[PDB]
Amino acid sequence: DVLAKELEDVNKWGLHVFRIAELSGNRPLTVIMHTIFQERDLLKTFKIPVDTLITYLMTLEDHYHADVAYHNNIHAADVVQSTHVLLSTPALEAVFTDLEILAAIFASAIHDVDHPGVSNQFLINTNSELALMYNDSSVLENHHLAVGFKLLQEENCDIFQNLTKKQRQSLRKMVIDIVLATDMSKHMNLLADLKTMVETKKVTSSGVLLLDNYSDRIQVLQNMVHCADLSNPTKPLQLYRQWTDRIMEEFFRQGDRERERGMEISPMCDKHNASVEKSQVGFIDYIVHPLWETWADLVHPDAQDILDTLEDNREWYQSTIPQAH
Amino acid sequence: DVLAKELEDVNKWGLHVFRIAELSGNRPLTVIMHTIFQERDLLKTFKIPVDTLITYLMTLEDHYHADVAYHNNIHAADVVQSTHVLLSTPALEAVFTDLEILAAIFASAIHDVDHPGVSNQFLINTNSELALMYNDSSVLENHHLAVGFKLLQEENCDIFQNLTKKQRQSLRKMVIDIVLATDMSKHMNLLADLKTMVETKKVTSSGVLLLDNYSDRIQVLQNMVHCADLSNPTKPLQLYRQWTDRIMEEFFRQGDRERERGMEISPMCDKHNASVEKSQVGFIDYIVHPLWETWADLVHPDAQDILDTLEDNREWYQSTIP
Numbered sequence A: 001d002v003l004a005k006e007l008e009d010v011n012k013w014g015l016h017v018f019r020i021a022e023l024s025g026n027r028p029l030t031v032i033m034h035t036i037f038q039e040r041d042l043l044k045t046f047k048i049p050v051d052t053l054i055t056y057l058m059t060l061e062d063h064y065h066a067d068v069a070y071h072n073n074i075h076a077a078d079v080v081q082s083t084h085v086l087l088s089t090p091a092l093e094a095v096f097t098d099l100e101i102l103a104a105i106f107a108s109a110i111h112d113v114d115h116p117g118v119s120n121q122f123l124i125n126t127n128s129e130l131a132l133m134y135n136d137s138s139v140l141e142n143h144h145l146a147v148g149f150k151l152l153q154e155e156n157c158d159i160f161q162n163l164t165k166k167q168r169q170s171l172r173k174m175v176i177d178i179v180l181a182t183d184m185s186k187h188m189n190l191l192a193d194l195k196t197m198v199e200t201k202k203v204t205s206s207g208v209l210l211l212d213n214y215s216d217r218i219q220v221l222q223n224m225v226h227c228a229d230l231s232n233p234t235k236p237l238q239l240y241r242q243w244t245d246r247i248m249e250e251f252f253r254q255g256d257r258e259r260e261r262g263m264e265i266s267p268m269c270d271k272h273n274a275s276v277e278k279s280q281v282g283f284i285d286y287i288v289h290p291l292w293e294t295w296a297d298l299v300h301p302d303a304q305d306i307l308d309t310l311e312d313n314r315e316w317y318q319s320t321i322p323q324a325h
Numbered sequence B: 001d002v003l004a005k006e007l008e009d010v011n012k013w014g015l016h017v018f019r020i021a022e023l024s025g026n027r028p029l030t031v032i033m034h035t036i037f038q039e040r041d042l043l044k045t046f047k048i049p050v051d052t053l054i055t056y057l058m059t060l061e062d063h064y065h066a067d068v069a070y071h072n073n074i075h076a077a078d079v080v081q082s083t084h085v086l087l088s089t090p091a092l093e094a095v096f097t098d099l100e101i102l103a104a105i106f107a108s109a110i111h112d113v114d115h116p117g118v119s120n121q122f123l124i125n126t127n128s129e130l131a132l133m134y135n136d137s138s139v140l141e142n143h144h145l146a147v148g149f150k151l152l153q154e155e156n157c158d159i160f161q162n163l164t165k166k167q168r169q170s171l172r173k174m175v176i177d178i179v180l181a182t183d184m185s186k187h188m189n190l191l192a193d194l195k196t197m198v199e200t201k202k203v204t205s206s207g208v209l210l211l212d213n214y215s216d217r218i219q220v221l222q223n224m225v226h227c228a229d230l231s232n233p234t235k236p237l238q239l240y241r242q243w244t245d246r247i248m249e250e251f252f253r254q255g256d257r258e259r260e261r262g263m264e265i266s267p268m269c270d271k272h273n274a275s276v277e278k279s280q281v282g283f284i285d286y287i288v289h290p291l292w293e294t295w296a297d298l299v300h301p302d303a304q305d306i307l308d309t310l311e312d313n314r315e316w317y318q319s320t321i322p
């Protein structure tokens, strides 16, 4: 119906993903992954039975928490769809193999599964079982990977059943490398390295990038998914505002637990003392723009419209903050 | 029943650790740990109730597998005692705080707990739940930490209950850093970085190392426990001979599991095609001597005898190659 109409924008930045969630009966991850797999002809390329794909996707989506305001299946679908757009950027045309493409999209799909709605630092500070299990290192991200892969074991869920042994091993490695890179404590290091990759990048005649070793290829995929994960402020203001609502609700809920426990309340987690405009402008100035501006450098001019929206949105949120002229 | 005469060598390289295991009713880890804590006055320094220490040690010791030939409670006891000796080296006099000392010894004690007797690569290749949990990265070492820490939560087991919050946090971080560095896959990088530290070491006149910050200190602790972990070929030969027998028995059993599942048998795990003596020489030539030579540089001349024993032991296995 209208859903197939909205799913026509799947190759477009700014998909009305929230609308798709409503219309699909809260199955945005399932329908968006399925649509993209059909789009990229992935079921045929990797001999994936459709009933298997759908069974896994539905189980995966089930394992995103409905009561978590931001880190849920809608965010997962959004990051999947955004990665799907970035993969098709002209500067990267026929750079990546079908397997690499599959890896980046699957990584995006599972990258926050079973997120509890609180940060790594919170989990470390409250001595959680998760932090105990993972020795305080990329606690959530290791966990997302473990669950995402574990779900492949469920009945009629192995979407990779017809990959070769070599392919499955290569895909597992790439997906691990990608999701671990979504850990924000690795952001400055990724960014610092991506800047250096940009400085010395090599391009063909028709302008596509030359990535001639796994280390360069995976670095580009890591930053790609990281950008997609941090892409909310680059979306039309109507989508962006909605993402901002959810992240602050999730944060304030974390803040509430912290205050109730007598802990120091984490930054931007205090519902009483917090400005949306100030927090978002800071977020953009110190994290999202430094990154997207570097990505735009890498694929210039492919991302200029994305960068323009980001800068517009930044200008928009700073406009109501009083400042010295 | 004593035993006490054996434990008089707890400060020496080449303590009779197998004897201690026998004499103590297979509680070498509890006994040696208890002895070292008393000697270093750690119970008083950190207000560790002695029954809490023993209770934790017995539980920890119970989670090393009796039926694993090498990676068992005797190996843990050995690595603890070896670290205990290395910490007392003159070149390191007054370098470490009591909390750092506590961290290195605790890390040594838990560093292989619940080892199943197969390698990281075997756990990965067989798609074990453990490799699934830890995403193929330092699978065992991540698991050893989780278990060692988890056991503090059993009844009357929290030996760190009277550390401050800041002390617990700092000790936790050091222990994690130290145990993750026992992963053999990190050996070449760790050693490379150790050589770099050695190239630019600072010492007082009496040769005492001057460490500047957490980076320096934890790097020395990591390498120290790694050396202790790889110390078998530097021990008196009779000790070394038994360690060699044990590690081969454990490797062969992994090989047997591999052969049975039609997997390629891992290097040195095929009992039908092994060259034990030749493999010890290569082990020393390519891993153990390059490490201990660098450590010996760091603490010159504290480790000269250790190095000499290493070279004598290399010649033993060389001369027993059929």
Ligand SMILES: C[C@@H]1CN(C(=O)CO/N=C/c2ccc(OC(F)F)c(OC3CCCC3)c2)C[C@@H](C)O1
Residues within 6 Å of the ligand: A119, A184, A232, A233, A240, A243, A244, A245, A247, A248, A267, A268, A279, A280, A283, A287
């Ligand atoms: C560098 C760390 C990152 N961080 C995280 O929790 C992990 O990732 N964040 C994702 C994120 C995603 C969307 C956000 O808003 C909108 F785009 F929705 C957003 O805006 C918040 C809202 C207050 C500012 C940060 C954050 C915490 C942060 C304060 O600084």
Ligand SMILES: C[C@@H]1CN(C(=O)CO/N=C/c2ccc(OC(F)F)c(OC3CCCC3)c2)C[C@@H](C)O1
Residues within 6 Å of the ligand: B118, B119, B184, B232, B233, B240, B243, B244, B245, B247, B251, B254, B266, B267, B268, B269, B279, B280, B283
């Ligand atoms: C299952 C294996 C695990 N692995 C390791 O490196 C683990 O670390 N080793 C410790 C070790 C400790 C003591 C050894 O001898 C004596 F000193 F005991 C010893 O003898 C080696 C080993 C056979 C000759 C060289 C090894 C390597 C891979 C094939 O898969």
Ligand SMILES: [Mg+2]
Residues within 6 Å of the ligand: A111, A112, A140, A182
């Ligand atoms: Mg995440």
Ligand SMILES: [Mg+2]
Residues within 6 Å of the ligand: none
């Ligand atoms: Mg003192």
Ligand SMILES: [Mg+2]
Residues within 6 Å of the ligand: B111, B112, B140, B182
């Ligand atoms: Mg080990």
Ligand SMILES: [Mg+2]
Residues within 6 Å of the ligand: B210, B211, B212, B213, B216
């Ligand atoms: Mg220094």
Ligand SMILES: [Mg+2]
Residues within 6 Å of the ligand: B312
């Ligand atoms: Mg001689």
Ligand SMILES: [Zn+2]
Residues within 6 Å of the ligand: A075, A079, A111, A112, A182, A229
């Ligand atoms: Zn995310």
Ligand SMILES: [Zn+2]
Residues within 6 Å of the ligand: B075, B079, B111, B112, B182, B229
């Ligand atoms: Zn060990």
